[PDB]
């Protein structure tokens, strides 16, 4: 009873002391020598104008041209970024959609939200329409994120405090990741997809192992919910977006915080986080109605993407690093460059 | 300058735009009602009168409603309550037989205070239903109301006890100039509840129309 709690407190004490020992010099001291990125001025190359409600998620295709966006007008819309054309428009059974994924192969998209179901859509059908491939049921809370591993496996993040790994052909949870004590809000697959990170409402981020399904590491420091998470392109770090108006960079190997991306006159929480192809810019959509670009190695804010008339809810960077799409609670997605 | 295939792609996108716009027109004329309540507080009773989210569809006198029951969403409400910013009205159910069954009246009262004063529902009217009137009427005589609110200076009789509870709920509203509260005492189950919803919703519709026209 009390002995177990005392032993848990002892283990936490020992862990924090061990990860304090490894912290000899901060990231700022190491990167105090490189020239600043300067000023990053990005103009809106495209405005995508189809949605009729708040856009809650977008995902880029791996070809860096097609993207899918979800809004609560009940539509999944697949855009052609270059020409602004709408490739597909997918009517959702439940319009309470909070998340959106685009399969790495491009054959599928996934969708989920307040109906506790992740729905998989077959984009490339012999019948010329988009159909519901599989409805993945089994979560007892809303779906807050989903990310395809391949055409057959998808990891889902839920508000019932658990992440799950699914097997789309059968629909059964291959593995359930149960460590969190609050709603799990985001999700980021490692580049090699051997492992992933999740940010939850208990102000903690947990590093998982997809193969054997246990929480490898737990990263703390945020003062409120974590609404968005994203891996550094290296696969050895990630950045979290929290409601306490702060982004943080956590290192898997050093095993704690590296740098804090906050400013005094930013008081609103971050809704989205994404890195640039080099990992030198960190982009975070805020509740200021606008995105903010951060020099990830110096914490200096390098630019602002101010083109939205409501909260920036979703945000992504192409795999070639070429453009940034930001969706917002006004019904527009804007492509920057 | 466009290819034949690319012009056909643009034409397809225009048809997609047209259908999206049609769907938006068809959906903008649904009345979106968000049904709340502390626990089992007569919510099922009025759903009879009229997964994680349950949508109910019905039509009353040529008006189409949608009722979103989120009683099964047993997760942190602050992370999905903004999804409903923009509903026509909120139907809040309180089972006022539970003024002494634990405390639950106080829990319903904090839920009402949280929802009414929320920053997403600042112009969203609230249709406060006060259910289980009969059980409260033939229970207030035995168990006094003083168990719930000590400061109640009134006789243990139904017709003023219910008014006191209504007053305590309506005094939680800190937006008395942007949103209305339409209280209704409901245990008759005689199609009065949907009529009350229809009246409150038509008032909200007229006000929303005036907002849109700029007139307000």
């Amino acid at each position, epitope marked *: 009873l009390d002995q177990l709690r005392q032993e848990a407190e002892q283990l936490k004490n020992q862990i924090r002391d061990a990860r304090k020992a490894c912290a000899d010099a901060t990231l700022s001291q190491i990167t105090n020598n490189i020239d600043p990125v300067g000023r990053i001025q990005m103009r809106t190359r495209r405005t995508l104008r189809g949605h009729l409600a708040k856009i809650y998620a977008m995902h880029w295709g791996t070809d860096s041209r097609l993207l899918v966006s979800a809004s609560q007008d009940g539509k999944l819309i697949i855009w052609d970024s270059y020409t602004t054309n709408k490739v597909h428009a997918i009517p959702l059974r439940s319009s309470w959609v909070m998340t959106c994924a685009y399969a790495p192969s491009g054959n599928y998209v996934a969708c989920g939200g307040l109906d506790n179901i992740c729905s998989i859509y077959n984009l490339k059908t012999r019948e010329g329409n988009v159909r519901v491939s599989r409805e993945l049921a089994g979560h007892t809370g809303y779906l807050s994120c989903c990310r395809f591993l391949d055409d057959n496996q998808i990891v889902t993040s839920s508000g019932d405090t658990t992440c799950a790994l699914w097997d789309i052909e059968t629909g059964q949870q291959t593995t359930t990741f149960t460590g969190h004590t609050g709603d799990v809000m985001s999700l980021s697959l490692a580049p090699d997809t051997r492992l992933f990170v999740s940010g939850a409402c208990d102000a903690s981020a947990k590093l998982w192992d997809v193969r054997e399904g246990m929480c490898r590491q737990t990263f703390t420091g945020h003062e409120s919910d974590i609404n968005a998470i994203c891996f550094f392109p290296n696969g050895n770090a990630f950045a979290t977006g929290s409601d306490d108006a702060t982004c943080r960079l956590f290192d898997l190997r050093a095993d704690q915080e590296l740098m804090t991306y906050s400013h005094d006159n930013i008081i609103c929480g971050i809704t989205s986080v994404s890195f640039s192809k080099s990992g030198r810019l960190l982009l975070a959509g805020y509740d200021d109605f606008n995105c903010n670009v951060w020099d990830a190695l110096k914490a200096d804010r390098a630019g602002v993407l101010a083109g939205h008339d409501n909260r920036v809810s979703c945000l992504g960077v192409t795999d070639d690093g070429m453009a940034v799409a930001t969706g917002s609670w006004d019904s527009f997605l804007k492509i920057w460059n | 300058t466009l290819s034949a295939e690319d012009k056909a792609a643009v034409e397809r996108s225009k*048809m997609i735009d047209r259908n999206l716009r049609e769907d938006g027109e068809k959906a903008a004329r649904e009345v979106k009602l968000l049904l709340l309540g502390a626990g089992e507080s007569g919510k099922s009773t009025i759903v009879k009168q009229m997964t994680g989210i349950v949508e109910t569809h019905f039509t009353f006198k040529d008006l189409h409603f949608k009722m979103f029951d989120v009683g099964a969403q047993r997760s942190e409400r602050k992370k999905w309550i903004h999804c409903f910013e923009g509903v026509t009205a909120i139907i809040f159910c309180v089972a006022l037989s539970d003024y002494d069954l634990v405390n639950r009246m106080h829990e319903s009262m904090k839920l009402f205070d949280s929802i009414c004063n929320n920053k997403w529902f600042t112009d969203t009217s609230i249709i406060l239903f006060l259910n289980k009137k009969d059980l409260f009427e033939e229970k207030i005589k035995k168990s006094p109301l003083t168990i719930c609110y000590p400061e109640y200076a009134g006789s243990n009789t139904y017709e003023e006890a219910a008014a006191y509870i209504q007053c305590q709920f309506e005094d939680l509203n800190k937006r008395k100039d942007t949103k209305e509260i339409y209280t209704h005492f409901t245990c008759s189950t005689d199609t009065k509840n949907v009529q009350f919803v229809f009246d409150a919703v038509t008032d909200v519709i007229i006000k929303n129309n005036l907002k849109d026209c700029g007139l307000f």
Partner: single-chain antibody
Amino acid sequence: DVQLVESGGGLVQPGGSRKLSCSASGFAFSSFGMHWVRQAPEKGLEWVAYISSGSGTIYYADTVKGRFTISRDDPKNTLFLQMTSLRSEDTAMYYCVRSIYYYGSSPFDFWGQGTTLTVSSSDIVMTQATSSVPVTPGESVSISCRSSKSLLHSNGNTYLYWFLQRPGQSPQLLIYRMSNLASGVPDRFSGSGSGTAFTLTISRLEAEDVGVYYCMQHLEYPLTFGAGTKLEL
């Protein structure tokens, strides 16, 4: 079950009128642009008309424009060709071909089985110099097509298509935009070429690859076919 079945063909007196139908089945007919493609009894293919999805765009071959009318009944999933004043140059087998255009789609992918009409008695030119070539099974053969204009558009696409018409069979899409393999086409097919010069390569040719190979251009309307390279043995 994606079948398109044509009907309405038959022997018609010259100068008369006849209406062709194409009853779709097993696909979202309303989303597909639909073509009519013609083949004379001993000649290669020849595009005839095209009606868009939503009927908003219609095109005709200049040799039929004014005489022919293409139309569709989306509720009934039927595609129509109304032919008036049928000349002797209109004896042929008419094919109903579906084609859907969006980024990365595969136009001309499914072809009907065709109906036969017998009438009783500028434009890009696509060249297939080799009218026939003898091939042994297991061997590798390459078919060449040449264009009078650069098929490569400013957007990077090279609107060249390859179709195979096995004997006594309807044409089958092999390669769209000069490089992309159609679904269900074995990987031993491959298409390559610069502007105006194109090649289709069959590696380890085996039976049921014999037939006539057509090269079509989808860069501009009218769509024009090659004469056809025929493979035997």
